[PDB]
PDB file of N, CA and C and ligand atoms in Angstrom:
ATOM      1  N   UNK F   1      28.263  55.463 -33.812  1.00  0.00           N
ATOM      2  CA  UNK F   1      26.894  55.229 -34.362  1.00  0.00           C
ATOM      3  C   UNK F   1      26.306  53.941 -33.754  1.00  0.00           C
ATOM      4  N   UNK F   2      27.132  53.126 -33.095  1.00  0.00           N
ATOM      5  CA  UNK F   2      26.562  51.934 -32.482  1.00  0.00           C
ATOM      6  C   UNK F   2      26.391  52.184 -30.997  1.00  0.00           C
ATOM      7  N   UNK F   3      25.400  51.519 -30.405  1.00  0.00           N
ATOM      8  CA  UNK F   3      25.131  51.608 -28.979  1.00  0.00           C
ATOM      9  C   UNK F   3      25.190  50.232 -28.385  1.00  0.00           C
ATOM     10  N   UNK F   4      25.813  50.109 -27.233  1.00  0.00           N
ATOM     11  CA  UNK F   4      25.887  48.871 -26.496  1.00  0.00           C
ATOM     12  C   UNK F   4      24.711  48.884 -25.562  1.00  0.00           C
ATOM     13  N   UNK F   5      24.067  47.732 -25.382  1.00  0.00           N
ATOM     14  CA  UNK F   5      22.921  47.658 -24.472  1.00  0.00           C
ATOM     15  C   UNK F   5      22.762  46.246 -23.946  1.00  0.00           C
ATOM     16  N   UNK F   6      21.967  46.102 -22.892  1.00  0.00           N
ATOM     17  CA  UNK F   6      21.736  44.821 -22.242  1.00  0.00           C
ATOM     18  C   UNK F   6      20.270  44.516 -22.405  1.00  0.00           C
ATOM     19  N   UNK F   7      19.895  43.318 -22.836  1.00  0.00           N
ATOM     20  CA  UNK F   7      18.487  42.990 -23.038  1.00  0.00           C
ATOM     21  C   UNK F   7      18.143  41.749 -22.235  1.00  0.00           C
ATOM     22  N   UNK F   8      17.139  41.832 -21.373  1.00  0.00           N
ATOM     23  CA  UNK F   8      16.740  40.709 -20.549  1.00  0.00           C
ATOM     24  C   UNK F   8      15.549  40.007 -21.162  1.00  0.00           C
ATOM     25  N   UNK F   9      15.692  38.700 -21.349  1.00  0.00           N
ATOM     26  CA  UNK F   9      14.646  37.845 -21.979  1.00  0.00           C
ATOM     27  C   UNK F   9      14.396  36.723 -20.979  1.00  0.00           C
ATOM     28  N   UNK F  10      13.138  36.377 -20.751  1.00  0.00           N
ATOM     29  CA  UNK F  10      12.788  35.362 -19.731  1.00  0.00           C
ATOM     30  C   UNK F  10      11.645  34.509 -20.161  1.00  0.00           C
ATOM     31  N   UNK F  11      11.700  33.203 -19.870  1.00  0.00           N
ATOM     32  CA  UNK F  11      10.567  32.323 -20.156  1.00  0.00           C
ATOM     33  C   UNK F  11      10.606  31.192 -19.147  1.00  0.00           C
ATOM     34  N   UNK F  12       9.612  30.320 -19.183  1.00  0.00           N
ATOM     35  CA  UNK F  12       9.570  29.246 -18.177  1.00  0.00           C
ATOM     36  C   UNK F  12      10.796  28.371 -18.216  1.00  0.00           C
ATOM     37  N   UNK F  13      11.362  28.058 -17.067  1.00  0.00           N
ATOM     38  CA  UNK F  13      12.553  27.187 -17.068  1.00  0.00           C
ATOM     39  C   UNK F  13      12.194  25.827 -17.670  1.00  0.00           C
ATOM     40  N   UNK F  14      13.131  25.317 -18.482  1.00  0.00           N
ATOM     41  CA  UNK F  14      12.960  24.031 -19.145  1.00  0.00           C
ATOM     42  C   UNK F  14      11.858  23.957 -20.190  1.00  0.00           C
ATOM     43  N   UNK F  15      11.448  25.090 -20.756  1.00  0.00           N
ATOM     44  CA  UNK F  15      10.405  25.146 -21.789  1.00  0.00           C
ATOM     45  C   UNK F  15      10.849  24.436 -23.002  1.00  0.00           C
ATOM     46  N   UNK F  16       9.884  23.841 -23.707  1.00  0.00           N
ATOM     47  CA  UNK F  16      10.177  23.146 -24.939  1.00  0.00           C
ATOM     48  C   UNK F  16      10.365  24.075 -26.162  1.00  0.00           C
ATOM     49  N   UNK F  17       9.994  25.350 -26.031  1.00  0.00           N
ATOM     50  CA  UNK F  17      10.159  26.319 -27.108  1.00  0.00           C
ATOM     51  C   UNK F  17      11.409  27.161 -26.848  1.00  0.00           C
ATOM     52  N   UNK F  18      12.083  27.609 -27.899  1.00  0.00           N
ATOM     53  CA  UNK F  18      13.238  28.496 -27.697  1.00  0.00           C
ATOM     54  C   UNK F  18      12.728  29.924 -27.454  1.00  0.00           C
ATOM     55  N   UNK F  19      13.660  30.834 -27.242  1.00  0.00           N
ATOM     56  CA  UNK F  19      13.313  32.214 -26.905  1.00  0.00           C
ATOM     57  C   UNK F  19      12.710  33.043 -28.016  1.00  0.00           C
ATOM     58  N   UNK F  20      12.742  32.542 -29.243  1.00  0.00           N
ATOM     59  CA  UNK F  20      12.109  33.321 -30.302  1.00  0.00           C
ATOM     60  C   UNK F  20      13.041  34.012 -31.240  1.00  0.00           C
ATOM     61  N   UNK F  21      14.353  33.733 -31.207  1.00  0.00           N
ATOM     62  CA  UNK F  21      15.216  34.384 -32.184  1.00  0.00           C
ATOM     63  C   UNK F  21      16.182  33.306 -32.721  1.00  0.00           C
ATOM     64  N   UNK F  22      16.732  33.571 -33.901  1.00  0.00           N
ATOM     65  CA  UNK F  22      17.781  32.694 -34.480  1.00  0.00           C
ATOM     66  C   UNK F  22      19.011  33.575 -34.670  1.00  0.00           C
ATOM     67  N   UNK F  23      20.173  32.933 -34.763  1.00  0.00           N
ATOM     68  CA  UNK F  23      21.440  33.630 -34.901  1.00  0.00           C
ATOM     69  C   UNK F  23      21.998  33.511 -36.299  1.00  0.00           C
ATOM     70  N   UNK F  24      22.542  34.628 -36.763  1.00  0.00           N
ATOM     71  CA  UNK F  24      23.287  34.716 -38.013  1.00  0.00           C
ATOM     72  C   UNK F  24      24.747  34.658 -37.630  1.00  0.00           C
ATOM     73  N   UNK F  25      25.400  33.557 -38.036  1.00  0.00           N
ATOM     74  CA  UNK F  25      26.836  33.432 -37.847  1.00  0.00           C
ATOM     75  C   UNK F  25      27.504  34.187 -38.978  1.00  0.00           C
ATOM     76  N   UNK F  26      28.286  35.210 -38.655  1.00  0.00           N
ATOM     77  CA  UNK F  26      29.022  35.964 -39.658  1.00  0.00           C
ATOM     78  C   UNK F  26      30.369  36.240 -38.997  1.00  0.00           C
ATOM     79  N   UNK F  27      31.144  35.185 -38.868  1.00  0.00           N
ATOM     80  CA  UNK F  27      32.433  35.214 -38.168  1.00  0.00           C
ATOM     81  C   UNK F  27      33.258  36.410 -38.681  1.00  0.00           C
ATOM     82  N   UNK F  28      33.975  37.116 -37.786  1.00  0.00           N
ATOM     83  CA  UNK F  28      34.089  36.825 -36.351  1.00  0.00           C
ATOM     84  C   UNK F  28      32.954  37.197 -35.401  1.00  0.00           C
ATOM     85  N   UNK F  29      31.836  37.660 -35.968  1.00  0.00           N
ATOM     86  CA  UNK F  29      30.709  37.972 -35.078  1.00  0.00           C
ATOM     87  C   UNK F  29      29.514  37.071 -35.228  1.00  0.00           C
ATOM     88  N   UNK F  30      28.614  37.156 -34.273  1.00  0.00           N
ATOM     89  CA  UNK F  30      27.273  36.518 -34.364  1.00  0.00           C
ATOM     90  C   UNK F  30      26.253  37.637 -34.196  1.00  0.00           C
ATOM     91  N   UNK F  31      25.151  37.523 -34.909  1.00  0.00           N
ATOM     92  CA  UNK F  31      24.107  38.561 -34.968  1.00  0.00           C
ATOM     93  C   UNK F  31      22.734  37.929 -34.868  1.00  0.00           C
ATOM     94  N   UNK F  32      21.739  38.752 -34.542  1.00  0.00           N
ATOM     95  CA  UNK F  32      20.361  38.249 -34.514  1.00  0.00           C
ATOM     96  C   UNK F  32      19.865  38.169 -35.957  1.00  0.00           C
ATOM     97  N   UNK F  33      19.492  36.954 -36.369  1.00  0.00           N
ATOM     98  CA  UNK F  33      19.007  36.764 -37.756  1.00  0.00           C
ATOM     99  C   UNK F  33      17.500  37.009 -37.912  1.00  0.00           C
ATOM    100  N   UNK F  34      16.748  36.646 -36.875  1.00  0.00           N
ATOM    101  CA  UNK F  34      15.284  36.760 -36.939  1.00  0.00           C
ATOM    102  C   UNK F  34      14.784  36.843 -35.507  1.00  0.00           C
ATOM    103  N   UNK F  35      13.616  37.492 -35.347  1.00  0.00           N
ATOM    104  CA  UNK F  35      12.910  37.630 -34.042  1.00  0.00           C
ATOM    105  C   UNK F  35      11.467  37.357 -34.375  1.00  0.00           C
ATOM    106  N   UNK F  36      10.932  36.289 -33.786  1.00  0.00           N
ATOM    107  CA  UNK F  36       9.596  35.833 -34.085  1.00  0.00           C
ATOM    108  C   UNK F  36       8.488  36.577 -33.382  1.00  0.00           C
ATOM    109  N   UNK F  37       7.482  36.969 -34.138  1.00  0.00           N
ATOM    110  CA  UNK F  37       6.313  37.608 -33.539  1.00  0.00           C
ATOM    111  C   UNK F  37       5.731  36.660 -32.513  1.00  0.00           C
ATOM    112  N   UNK F  38       5.320  37.275 -31.406  1.00  0.00           N
ATOM    113  CA  UNK F  38       4.701  36.576 -30.295  1.00  0.00           C
ATOM    114  C   UNK F  38       5.643  35.944 -29.282  1.00  0.00           C
ATOM    115  N   UNK F  39       6.955  36.039 -29.522  1.00  0.00           N
ATOM    116  CA  UNK F  39       7.917  35.374 -28.682  1.00  0.00           C
ATOM    117  C   UNK F  39       8.467  36.219 -27.558  1.00  0.00           C
ATOM    118  N   UNK F  40       9.131  35.579 -26.588  1.00  0.00           N
ATOM    119  CA  UNK F  40       9.755  36.333 -25.489  1.00  0.00           C
ATOM    120  C   UNK F  40      10.789  37.324 -26.063  1.00  0.00           C
ATOM    121  N   UNK F  41      11.515  36.937 -27.102  1.00  0.00           N
ATOM    122  CA  UNK F  41      12.536  37.835 -27.664  1.00  0.00           C
ATOM    123  C   UNK F  41      11.894  39.073 -28.285  1.00  0.00           C
ATOM    124  N   UNK F  42      10.699  38.955 -28.890  1.00  0.00           N
ATOM    125  CA  UNK F  42      10.026  40.106 -29.449  1.00  0.00           C
ATOM    126  C   UNK F  42       9.521  40.968 -28.295  1.00  0.00           C
ATOM    127  N   UNK F  43       8.959  40.325 -27.278  1.00  0.00           N
ATOM    128  CA  UNK F  43       8.446  41.074 -26.118  1.00  0.00           C
ATOM    129  C   UNK F  43       9.595  41.914 -25.545  1.00  0.00           C
ATOM    130  N   UNK F  44      10.783  41.302 -25.445  1.00  0.00           N
ATOM    131  CA  UNK F  44      11.948  42.005 -24.855  1.00  0.00           C
ATOM    132  C   UNK F  44      12.604  43.014 -25.741  1.00  0.00           C
ATOM    133  N   UNK F  45      12.164  43.065 -26.988  1.00  0.00           N
ATOM    134  CA  UNK F  45      12.635  44.036 -27.981  1.00  0.00           C
ATOM    135  C   UNK F  45      14.049  43.854 -28.470  1.00  0.00           C
ATOM    136  N   UNK F  46      14.427  42.561 -28.604  1.00  0.00           N
ATOM    137  CA  UNK F  46      15.675  42.227 -29.322  1.00  0.00           C
ATOM    138  C   UNK F  46      15.372  42.507 -30.781  1.00  0.00           C
ATOM    139  N   UNK F  47      16.365  42.959 -31.530  1.00  0.00           N
ATOM    140  CA  UNK F  47      16.124  43.276 -32.953  1.00  0.00           C
ATOM    141  C   UNK F  47      17.079  42.588 -33.924  1.00  0.00           C
ATOM    142  N   UNK F  48      16.549  42.292 -35.111  1.00  0.00           N
ATOM    143  CA  UNK F  48      17.367  41.694 -36.189  1.00  0.00           C
ATOM    144  C   UNK F  48      18.544  42.615 -36.442  1.00  0.00           C
ATOM    145  N   UNK F  49      19.715  41.988 -36.675  1.00  0.00           N
ATOM    146  CA  UNK F  49      21.001  42.649 -36.906  1.00  0.00           C
ATOM    147  C   UNK F  49      21.705  43.107 -35.653  1.00  0.00           C
ATOM    148  N   UNK F  50      21.062  42.991 -34.487  1.00  0.00           N
ATOM    149  CA  UNK F  50      21.801  43.314 -33.268  1.00  0.00           C
ATOM    150  C   UNK F  50      22.996  42.358 -33.193  1.00  0.00           C
ATOM    151  N   UNK F  51      24.189  42.841 -32.874  1.00  0.00           N
ATOM    152  CA  UNK F  51      25.367  41.963 -32.723  1.00  0.00           C
ATOM    153  C   UNK F  51      25.352  41.405 -31.332  1.00  0.00           C
ATOM    154  N   UNK F  52      25.502  40.096 -31.189  1.00  0.00           N
ATOM    155  CA  UNK F  52      25.439  39.469 -29.879  1.00  0.00           C
ATOM    156  C   UNK F  52      26.862  39.420 -29.306  1.00  0.00           C
ATOM    157  N   UNK F  53      27.077  40.077 -28.169  1.00  0.00           N
ATOM    158  CA  UNK F  53      28.373  40.110 -27.548  1.00  0.00           C
ATOM    159  C   UNK F  53      28.545  39.096 -26.456  1.00  0.00           C
ATOM    160  N   UNK F  54      27.503  38.890 -25.663  1.00  0.00           N
ATOM    161  CA  UNK F  54      27.567  37.918 -24.580  1.00  0.00           C
ATOM    162  C   UNK F  54      26.158  37.514 -24.147  1.00  0.00           C
ATOM    163  N   UNK F  55      26.035  36.334 -23.575  1.00  0.00           N
ATOM    164  CA  UNK F  55      24.774  35.957 -22.926  1.00  0.00           C
ATOM    165  C   UNK F  55      25.125  35.496 -21.517  1.00  0.00           C
ATOM    166  N   UNK F  56      24.376  35.991 -20.526  1.00  0.00           N
ATOM    167  CA  UNK F  56      24.615  35.614 -19.153  1.00  0.00           C
ATOM    168  C   UNK F  56      26.125  35.773 -18.864  1.00  0.00           C
ATOM    169  N   UNK F  57      26.796  34.749 -18.399  1.00  0.00           N
ATOM    170  CA  UNK F  57      28.242  34.946 -18.101  1.00  0.00           C
ATOM    171  C   UNK F  57      29.176  34.479 -19.206  1.00  0.00           C
ATOM    172  N   UNK F  58      28.717  34.437 -20.455  1.00  0.00           N
ATOM    173  CA  UNK F  58      29.511  33.890 -21.537  1.00  0.00           C
ATOM    174  C   UNK F  58      29.687  34.923 -22.613  1.00  0.00           C
ATOM    175  N   UNK F  59      30.935  35.382 -22.787  1.00  0.00           N
ATOM    176  CA  UNK F  59      31.234  36.325 -23.867  1.00  0.00           C
ATOM    177  C   UNK F  59      31.517  35.469 -25.114  1.00  0.00           C
ATOM    178  N   UNK F  60      30.905  35.798 -26.235  1.00  0.00           N
ATOM    179  CA  UNK F  60      31.186  35.053 -27.464  1.00  0.00           C
ATOM    180  C   UNK F  60      32.603  35.260 -27.979  1.00  0.00           C
ATOM    181  N   UNK F  61      33.176  34.178 -28.459  1.00  0.00           N
ATOM    182  CA  UNK F  61      34.423  34.344 -29.186  1.00  0.00           C
ATOM    183  C   UNK F  61      34.388  33.311 -30.291  1.00  0.00           C
ATOM    184  N   UNK F  62      34.912  33.756 -31.424  1.00  0.00           N
ATOM    185  CA  UNK F  62      34.987  32.882 -32.562  1.00  0.00           C
ATOM    186  C   UNK F  62      35.801  31.644 -32.273  1.00  0.00           C
ATOM    187  N   UNK F  63      36.671  31.714 -31.262  1.00  0.00           N
ATOM    188  CA  UNK F  63      37.535  30.568 -30.868  1.00  0.00           C
ATOM    189  C   UNK F  63      36.815  29.513 -30.047  1.00  0.00           C
ATOM    190  N   UNK F  64      35.641  29.813 -29.502  1.00  0.00           N
ATOM    191  CA  UNK F  64      34.950  28.699 -28.806  1.00  0.00           C
ATOM    192  C   UNK F  64      33.444  28.733 -28.960  1.00  0.00           C
ATOM    193  N   UNK F  65      33.038  28.274 -30.131  1.00  0.00           N
ATOM    194  CA  UNK F  65      31.645  28.166 -30.439  1.00  0.00           C
ATOM    195  C   UNK F  65      31.048  27.039 -29.630  1.00  0.00           C
ATOM    196  N   UNK F  66      31.848  26.073 -29.191  1.00  0.00           N
ATOM    197  CA  UNK F  66      31.287  24.962 -28.433  1.00  0.00           C
ATOM    198  C   UNK F  66      30.725  25.510 -27.115  1.00  0.00           C
ATOM    199  N   UNK F  67      31.536  26.255 -26.378  1.00  0.00           N
ATOM    200  CA  UNK F  67      31.042  26.846 -25.101  1.00  0.00           C
ATOM    201  C   UNK F  67      29.870  27.766 -25.370  1.00  0.00           C
ATOM    202  N   UNK F  68      29.862  28.442 -26.514  1.00  0.00           N
ATOM    203  CA  UNK F  68      28.726  29.302 -26.823  1.00  0.00           C
ATOM    204  C   UNK F  68      27.432  28.510 -26.931  1.00  0.00           C
ATOM    205  N   UNK F  69      27.490  27.436 -27.704  1.00  0.00           N
ATOM    206  CA  UNK F  69      26.353  26.626 -27.870  1.00  0.00           C
ATOM    207  C   UNK F  69      25.900  26.027 -26.559  1.00  0.00           C
ATOM    208  N   UNK F  70      26.834  25.622 -25.712  1.00  0.00           N
ATOM    209  CA  UNK F  70      26.461  25.098 -24.392  1.00  0.00           C
ATOM    210  C   UNK F  70      25.812  26.183 -23.545  1.00  0.00           C
ATOM    211  N   UNK F  71      26.286  27.429 -23.614  1.00  0.00           N
ATOM    212  CA  UNK F  71      25.629  28.515 -22.857  1.00  0.00           C
ATOM    213  C   UNK F  71      24.219  28.813 -23.345  1.00  0.00           C
ATOM    214  N   UNK F  72      23.997  28.710 -24.647  1.00  0.00           N
ATOM    215  CA  UNK F  72      22.671  28.904 -25.199  1.00  0.00           C
ATOM    216  C   UNK F  72      21.733  27.812 -24.717  1.00  0.00           C
ATOM    217  N   UNK F  73      22.195  26.552 -24.684  1.00  0.00           N
ATOM    218  CA  UNK F  73      21.320  25.463 -24.231  1.00  0.00           C
ATOM    219  C   UNK F  73      21.016  25.613 -22.750  1.00  0.00           C
ATOM    220  N   UNK F  74      22.001  26.035 -21.994  1.00  0.00           N
ATOM    221  CA  UNK F  74      21.802  26.253 -20.569  1.00  0.00           C
ATOM    222  C   UNK F  74      20.780  27.378 -20.310  1.00  0.00           C
ATOM    223  N   UNK F  75      20.815  28.454 -21.090  1.00  0.00           N
ATOM    224  CA  UNK F  75      19.849  29.526 -20.885  1.00  0.00           C
ATOM    225  C   UNK F  75      18.465  28.989 -21.172  1.00  0.00           C
ATOM    226  N   UNK F  76      18.318  28.035 -22.101  1.00  0.00           N
ATOM    227  CA  UNK F  76      16.998  27.458 -22.368  1.00  0.00           C
ATOM    228  C   UNK F  76      16.562  26.673 -21.156  1.00  0.00           C
ATOM    229  N   UNK F  77      17.498  26.016 -20.498  1.00  0.00           N
ATOM    230  CA  UNK F  77      17.154  25.280 -19.300  1.00  0.00           C
ATOM    231  C   UNK F  77      16.722  26.202 -18.160  1.00  0.00           C
ATOM    232  N   UNK F  78      17.397  27.329 -17.935  1.00  0.00           N
ATOM    233  CA  UNK F  78      17.057  28.218 -16.789  1.00  0.00           C
ATOM    234  C   UNK F  78      15.890  29.166 -17.157  1.00  0.00           C
ATOM    235  N   UNK F  79      15.720  29.444 -18.455  1.00  0.00           N
ATOM    236  CA  UNK F  79      14.708  30.405 -18.863  1.00  0.00           C
ATOM    237  C   UNK F  79      15.136  31.851 -18.764  1.00  0.00           C
ATOM    238  N   UNK F  80      16.391  32.104 -18.442  1.00  0.00           N
ATOM    239  CA  UNK F  80      16.874  33.482 -18.309  1.00  0.00           C
ATOM    240  C   UNK F  80      18.005  33.751 -19.265  1.00  0.00           C
ATOM    241  N   UNK F  81      17.842  34.802 -20.029  1.00  0.00           N
ATOM    242  CA  UNK F  81      18.847  35.169 -20.987  1.00  0.00           C
ATOM    243  C   UNK F  81      19.091  36.675 -20.924  1.00  0.00           C
ATOM    244  N   UNK F  82      20.219  37.092 -20.355  1.00  0.00           N
ATOM    245  CA  UNK F  82      20.594  38.510 -20.272  1.00  0.00           C
ATOM    246  C   UNK F  82      21.653  38.676 -21.369  1.00  0.00           C
ATOM    247  N   UNK F  83      21.279  39.381 -22.427  1.00  0.00           N
ATOM    248  CA  UNK F  83      22.144  39.508 -23.606  1.00  0.00           C
ATOM    249  C   UNK F  83      22.825  40.818 -23.728  1.00  0.00           C
ATOM    250  N   UNK F  84      24.119  40.831 -23.921  1.00  0.00           N
ATOM    251  CA  UNK F  84      24.789  42.109 -24.186  1.00  0.00           C
ATOM    252  C   UNK F  84      24.886  42.195 -25.699  1.00  0.00           C
ATOM    253  N   UNK F  85      24.301  43.208 -26.306  1.00  0.00           N
ATOM    254  CA  UNK F  85      24.318  43.390 -27.731  1.00  0.00           C
ATOM    255  C   UNK F  85      24.825  44.749 -28.125  1.00  0.00           C
ATOM    256  N   UNK F  86      25.186  44.867 -29.385  1.00  0.00           N
ATOM    257  CA  UNK F  86      25.639  46.124 -30.002  1.00  0.00           C
ATOM    258  C   UNK F  86      24.670  46.341 -31.149  1.00  0.00           C
ATOM    259  N   UNK F  87      23.999  47.480 -31.142  1.00  0.00           N
ATOM    260  CA  UNK F  87      23.007  47.859 -32.136  1.00  0.00           C
ATOM    261  C   UNK F  87      23.560  48.982 -32.970  1.00  0.00           C
ATOM    262  N   UNK F  88      23.608  48.763 -34.281  1.00  0.00           N
ATOM    263  CA  UNK F  88      24.196  49.802 -35.115  1.00  0.00           C
ATOM    264  C   UNK F  88      23.120  50.741 -35.622  1.00  0.00           C
ATOM    265  N   UNK F  89      23.416  52.038 -35.634  1.00  0.00           N
ATOM    266  CA  UNK F  89      22.423  52.992 -36.094  1.00  0.00           C
ATOM    267  C   UNK F  89      22.549  53.340 -37.574  1.00  0.00           C
TER     268      UNK F  89
HETATM  269 NI1   NI E   1      21.034  42.821 -42.029  1.00  0.00          NI
HETATM  270 NI1   NI E   2      15.013  31.352 -12.379  1.00  0.00          NI
END
């Protein structure tokens, strides 16, 4: 009932605004908590409750949230976020 998919989100490199979504930490997983109207994440059609599996070259693991957070900050710097998510039906 779940589908794996890849979602590409892009904005100006080094922008002062984030991509438009917040994360719900529900260890051992992380999920999309909110997607803001008007944002790059809404344009790209990321959805609330999508499970976040990886961003760019970083697979999430409950064992290293530090590297996760560093990968998220780096994607804000480059403006490119290719997300592997699992969407439950
Ligand atoms: Ni929910
Ligand atoms: Ni670029």
